[PDB]
């Protein structure tokens, strides 16, 4: 269960890859949905939080990848450093991330293309095939998304690889379109749309069941802002492609963190500008459900601009889509090659020299998830999986920073006030126990801060007592971790505040996970149950380290 394993692109190239993968559905489709449903103009703030969390995780990766000479996905680093069960959990979460990202981006791109051509494909889908399960499954099955995923899986199986030149060209086109969107919003949009009142709570169309909120900058409150931030964390995903690709890098461990941070900041700037433009050109409750940005452009009289956006989106959604489809089999293959998953997934075809079985299985799963579930459901599922993976990696960094270099009874004095200058096995055990306790207490705090939010506002004694005790004990345990000595082993890059910053990252990630709806949590629980079943039924016994 704890078995550990024995282990050019420029910085601008890494930044381009990260921007290409990260930018996409999050801004071109989900921005309007979050602006209309979860947060209003305050969506601009919703990205900011989602950005900072995305930064907090990213920094950890820089250290997490700095500890392993061989560059690769977080599964590689976990299986090198922490053990086998944690590595399997991380790899399973990454597999969910990639599969559901493929599904969601395929949905968004299929919907965009269908709307561009007058929504004929969606009309046919409604006419000939209805799931009839509005609560759980999608009202409209996206057959075109299935076709797209089938085509791209066929391309991948036959040996098609990442064309960096095409990625750069599409990223440049998308960034130009985003800059045009920002400029058009600041030219046509007005601050009055951020100051709406009941006098303006009337979309001149014939729509009904419109949520007008309170109006103003934050119509749905800071709770809505936090929900929007949890949703928008989806937009910042995909920066992991830099490490995942595995192609030789001029300065891997130094360019990778810099590239990740630069891509995250650039994506945050783009998202902030585009969301501000969208909410300034058109009222948040007036935003078109199918096409928010083209709808806003039409509202301002720049109808033809829908074509320009229709280009940029169809570019970004392409680069984003492949960004999820290319890594998707690789991790499985790795998990198949390490014996954690079924060995038939590790089989490589002689003709193609690629993991054909793994690619086909992952593509079929992604196509099914796209066929059955709505865009928002897939987005939230991927968000919860990615947040869990990020929290796991942050905890990995926090624990490993204090562990002694690898090949119960305790005393209060040694725990509170150790005097050894370098970590011992006792210090490592204390830090592991402290990390577990801190994770449990952070989960408790987030549960009380969300489920008992009204109770905390109501001031009920039990809720306030639990909150205060949990926060104080979290601070105490973080201090205990502070007192322990850090490993003197030199690292190319380090988290600046490794005893606080990873804890804050874990807290933020878990809090954002709590913001997600019950359906997302149920789906994630079922996925984790399947993963644990596979691990404990097949992973342990067939592990190559056995």
């Amino acid at each position: 269960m704890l078995r550990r394993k024995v282990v050019c692109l420029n910085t601008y190239d890494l930044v381009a890859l990260g921007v290409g993968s990260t930018l996409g559905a999050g801004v071109y489709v989900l921005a309007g949905a979050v602006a209309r449903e979860n947060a209003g103009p305050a969506i601009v703030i919703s990205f900011l939080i989602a950005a900072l969390a995305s930064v907090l995780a990213g920094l950890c990766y820089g250290e997490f990848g700095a500890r392993v000479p061989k560059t690769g996905s977080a599964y590689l680093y976990s299986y090198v450093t922490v053990g086998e069960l944690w590595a399997f959990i991380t790899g399973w979460n990454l597999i969910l991330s990639y599969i559901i990202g493929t599904s969601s981006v395929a949905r968004a791109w299929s919907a965009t293309f269908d709307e561009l051509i007058g929504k004929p494909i969606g009309e046919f889908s409604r006419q000939h095939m209805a799931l009839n399960a509005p609560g759980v499954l999608a009202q409209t099955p996206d057959i075109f998304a299935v076709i797209i995923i089938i085509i791209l899986t066929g391309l991948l199986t036959l040996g098609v690889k990442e064309s960096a030149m095409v990625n750069k060209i599409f990223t440049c086109i998308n960034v130009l379109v985003l800059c045009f969107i920002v400029v058009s919003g600041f030219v046509k949009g007005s601050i009055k749309n951020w100051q709406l009142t009941e006098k303006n709570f009337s979309c001149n169309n014939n729509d009904t069941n419109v949520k007008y909120g309170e109006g103003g900058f934050m119509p749905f409150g800071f709770s809505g802002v936090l929900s929007g931030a949890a949703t928008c964390f989806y937009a910042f995903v995909g920066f992991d492609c830099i490490a995942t690709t595995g192609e030789e890098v001029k300065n891997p461990q130094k360019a990778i963190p810099v590239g990740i941070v630069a891509s995250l900041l650039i994506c945050f700037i783009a998202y902030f500008g585009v969301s501000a433009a969208l909410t300034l050109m058109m009222p948040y409750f007036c935003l078109d459900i199918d096409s928010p940005l083209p709808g806003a452009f039409k509202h301002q009289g720049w109808e033809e601009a829908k074509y320009a956006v229709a280009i940029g989106s169809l570019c970004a959604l392409s680069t984003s889509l492949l960004g999820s489809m290319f890594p998707m089999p690789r991790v499985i293959y790795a998990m198949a090659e390490d014996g954690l998953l079924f060995k038939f997934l590790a089989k490589i075809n002689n003709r193609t020299k690629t993991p054909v079985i793994a690619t086909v299985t992952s593509g079929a799963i992604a196509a099914v998830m796209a066929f059955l579930f709505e865009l928002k459901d897939l987005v939230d599922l991927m968000s919860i999986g990615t947040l869990l993976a990020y929290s796991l990696v942050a905890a990995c960094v926090l624990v490993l920073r204090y562990q002694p270099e690898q090949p119960e009874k305790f005393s209060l004095k040694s725990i509170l006030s150790p005097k050894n200058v370098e970590p011992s096995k006792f210090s490592g055990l204390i830090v592991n126990i402290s990390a577990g306790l801190l994770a449990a207490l952070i989960i408790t705090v987030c549960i009380v801060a969300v489920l008992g939010r009204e109770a905390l506002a109501e001031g009920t004694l039990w809720a306030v007592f639990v909150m205060t005790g949990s926060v104080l004990l979290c601070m105490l345990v973080t201090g205990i971790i502070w007192r322990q000595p850090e490993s003197k082993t030199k690292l190319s890059f380090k988290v600046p505040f490794v005893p606080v910053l990873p804890v804050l990252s874990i807290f933020v990630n878990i809090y954002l996970m709590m913001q997600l709806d019950q359906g997302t949590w149920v789906r994630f629980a079922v996925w984790m149950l399947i993963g644990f079943t596979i691990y404990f039924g097949y992973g342990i016994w067939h592990s190559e380290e056995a």
Binding site: E198, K199, T208, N209, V210, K211, G213, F220, S223
Partner: protein, 223 residues
């Protein structure tokens, strides 16, 4: 002799926002005034969202899709969505739902503080800017957990309609925050109603406890 008596409830600016009338002898008719908490807020403090609305104006805000009139272009579903994130005010139907919830919750409610007619000691509480009470213990009526009461207070204020009754009226987009104001024995003895008297009603919430100033006065004409 018998006069056409009329009891008027005025906003903070002393403009008549509600009124009842009847033919009675002077000082013999003491009806249960039932002004809407929102009517008192017409042209009131900016918090209630009616600072520019004139007295007797129609209730603002789009109709709820769940209202008796059914769905319509621009109808709002906020009246069915959770009210936890809404501010208690009177600018929209769902805001009026939130105001009713705040005014009916046991842990919350409203407290009314006497104004000019209050004694010298109560004068220490504060001026109209504080809604006649800047310190606790200056409320003589209103619905709150400690249930304030004063023998010398002229009126007693409570919620006229329950939450279940008020929800449907809110969904109809009508005024749905009626306040039952009953003259006390001390108030009945008082004959200065013609000049009029003023109170300050403040919501009991987590925050500034937003409030407004209202007044009650009597007019009479030849029958």
């Amino acid at each position: 002799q018998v006069y056409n008596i009329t009891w008027e409830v005025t906003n903070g600016d002393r403009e008549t926002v509600w009124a009842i009338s009847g033919n009675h002898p002077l000082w013999t008719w003491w009806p249960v005034l039932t002004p809407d908490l929102c009517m008192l807020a017409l042209s009131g403090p900016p918090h209630w969202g009616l600072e520019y609305q004139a007295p007797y104006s129609s209730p603002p805000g789009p109709p709820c899709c769940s209202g008796s009139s059914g769905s319509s272009a621009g109808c709002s579903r906020d009246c069915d969505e959770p009210l936890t994130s809404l501010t208690p005010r009177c600018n929209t139907a769902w805001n009026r739902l939130k105001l009713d919830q705040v005014t009916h919750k046991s842990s919350e409610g409203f407290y009314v503080c006497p104004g000019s007619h209050r004694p010298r000691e109560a004068k220490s509480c504060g001026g109209p800017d504080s809604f006649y009470c800047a310190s606790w213990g200056c409320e003589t009526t209103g619905r709150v957990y400690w249930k304030p009461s004063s023998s010398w207070d002229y009126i007693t204020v409570d919620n006229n309609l329950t939450t279940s009754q008020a929800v449907q009226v809110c969904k109809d987009n009508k005024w749905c925050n009626p306040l039952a104001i009953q003259f006390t024995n001390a108030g009945k003895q008082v004959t200065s109603w013609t000049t009029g008297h003023y109170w300050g009603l403040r919501l009991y919430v987590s925050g500034r406890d937003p409030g407004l100033t209202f007044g009650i006065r009597l007019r009479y004409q030849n029958l």
